């Protein structure tokens, strides 16, 4: 159910840039970038997806132990927004808690669409 996710959080980050929210999001995909691997995440708030999430390196054990993996649901407890020269906003995830594992969720929630920058 999309009622499980923080519908509109991605739009709020993209437009207002406020970090004082603790949104509940679903991981759609993770990709490593290579030095330690740095993880880039495609997340959903049930309404939109956005692929400019970057994982802080302190959180890498969640991915390497597969606690944070595609289709899991997590709650963000601390994030930093950085706005690039061209207007894109990068979201750096500092602290998060996985609320429901990928195994338990099983599937993408809803039919979110890419945020149109």
């Amino acid at each position: 159910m999309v009622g499980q996710l923080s519908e509109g959080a991605i739009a709020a980050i993209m437009q207002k840039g406020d970090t004082n929210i603790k949104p509940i999001l679903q991981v759609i995909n993770i990709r490593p970038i290579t030095s330690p691997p740095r993880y880039r995440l495609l997340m959903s708030d049930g309404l939109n997806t956005l692929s400019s999430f970057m994982l802080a390196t302190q959180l890498n054990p969640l991915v390497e132990e597969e606690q944070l993996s595609s289709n899991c649901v997590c709650q963000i407890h601390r994030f930093i927004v950085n706005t690039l020269k061209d207007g894109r906003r990068v979201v750096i995830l500092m602290e998060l808690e996985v609320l429901k594992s990928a195994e338990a969720v099983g599937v993408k929630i809803g039919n979110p669409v890419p945020y149109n920058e």
Binding site: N29, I33, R38, R40, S52, V90, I92, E117
Partner: peptide, 29 residues
């Protein structure tokens, strides 16, 4: 976890993102 250490990591994560051009279509921004 210092303030300056976090700033350097935010900058690095942003450069990592900007140079990530060889990803598949779902990652295009």
């Amino acid at each position: 976890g210092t303030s300056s250490g976090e700033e350097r990591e935010v900058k690095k994560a942003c450069e990592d993102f900007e140079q990530d051009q060889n990803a598949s279509e779902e990652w295009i921004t």
